[PDB]
Amino acid sequence: GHMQKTAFIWDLDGTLLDSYEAILSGIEETFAQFSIPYDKEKVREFIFKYSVQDLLVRVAEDRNLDVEVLNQVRAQSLAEKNAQVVLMPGAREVLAWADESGIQQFIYTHKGNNAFTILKDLGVESYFTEILTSQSGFVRKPSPEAATYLLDKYQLNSDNTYYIGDRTLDVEFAQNSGIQSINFLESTYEGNHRIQALADISRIFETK
């Protein structure tokens, strides 16, 4: 219950967008053009370990093709048309809890002004009081500038703010500013709370 002044930051890549389908379906069409078997399970794993770019290499090189052709074959794809970007089916638990709790949630990414539309569309523009983008102009990484921006904008607290971003780079800028993070992985910071889901975000603040 309770929830003192807590502020929250989400990303816009893969923490709360599961658009990986609408990407990945493009490469299924690439594997098919070379008579390569494609298994979503083998792909979703490898794209989390390595790049797209690496995978096309790691098939062509094995299969007696050339990734130089595969590069072009990955452009002449249909699933970039016949697909769309979801609202990460499960986070509306946390979204609701935090907003009832009055936790000012925000977003930071490099995405374009189309970002704001995606949230409006999918139903969750309210849930992030303010959202930053490519237009914001901030430094690359670590970028504590973007933290201080959101703090001063509504007179929020560094120590009482928490960035959820799924990466070791969640602690770097966080530490440079003096704010906390919540990630699925360990890193060598004191404001770094491991999780496995999204519903563990509430359990942190419910003493578990």
Side-chain angles (χ1 to χ4, degrees):
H2 24 90
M3 299 315 301
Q4 238 295 298
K5 275 235 79 72
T6 303
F8 251 34
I9 310 169
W10 295 100
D11 117 295
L12 206 77
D13 186 11
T15 311
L16 233 57
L17 278 76
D18 203 350
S19 81
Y20 283 111
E21 287 212 278
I23 293 161
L24 288 181
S25 298
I27 303 173
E28 183 163 45
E29 229 69 81
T30 318
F31 276 41
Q33 262 163 116
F34 289 94
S35 186
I36 309 178
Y38 175 93
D39 206 290
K40 186 64 52 65
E41 292 217 78
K42 83 126 73 139
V43 189
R44 289 183 173 285
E45 93 183 329
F46 187 88
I47 61 125
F48 258 66
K49 31 183 15 164
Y50 314 67
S51 209
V52 308
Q53 198 87 71
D54 297 81
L55 182 256
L56 307 75
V57 183
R58 267 62 207 293
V59 195
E61 179 73 353
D62 189 265
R63 179 52 192 84
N64 211 127
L65 313 173
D66 195 358
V67 66
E68 304 298 343
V69 196
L70 286 50
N71 263 278
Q72 284 159 62
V73 170
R74 211 209 107 277
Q76 62 212 265
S77 288
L78 69 67
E80 60 146 91
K81 296 117 75 135
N82 31 83
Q84 64 91 50
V85 183
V86 297
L87 196 249
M88 183 66 70
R92 275 290 270 95
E93 274 182 52
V94 181
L95 287 173
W97 158 80
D99 170 75
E100 270 291 347
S101 299
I103 307 181
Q104 300 241 178
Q105 335 190 59
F106 303 98
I107 284 177
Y108 183 36
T109 192
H110 67 269
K111 205 175 198 98
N113 246 297
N114 66 289
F116 302 103
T117 321
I118 295 166
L119 293 330
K120 288 171 210 273
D121 223 327
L122 291 170
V124 47
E125 57 127 77
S126 282
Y127 276 127
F128 323 96
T129 291
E130 240 165 70
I131 288 120
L132 287 301
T133 45
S134 247
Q135 299 294 10
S136 306
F138 297 131
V139 300
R140 48 250 271 182
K141 34 278 207 174
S143 62
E145 312 290 349
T148 297
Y149 174 98
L150 288 176
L151 293 170
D152 232 294
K153 238 288 180 174
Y154 206 69
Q155 307 294 254
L156 263 44
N157 242 83
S158 308
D159 175 76
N160 320 140
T161 206
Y162 295 87
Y163 171 48
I164 305 130
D166 77 61
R167 58 176 189 169
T168 189
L169 229 165
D170 293 337
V171 298
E172 287 248 60
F173 92 77
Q175 190 155 201
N176 285 239
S177 31
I179 75 182
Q180 318 298 288
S181 252
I182 306 174
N183 44 11
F184 298 96
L185 32 56
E186 258 181 51
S187 280
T188 41
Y189 186 50
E190 308 202 278
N192 177 104
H193 301 271
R194 272 201 78 177
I195 61 165
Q196 40 91 88
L198 257 19
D200 14 30
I201 298 165
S202 65
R203 86 172 109 273
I204 291 166
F205 308 99
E206 289 182 30
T207 301
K208 306 199 191 200

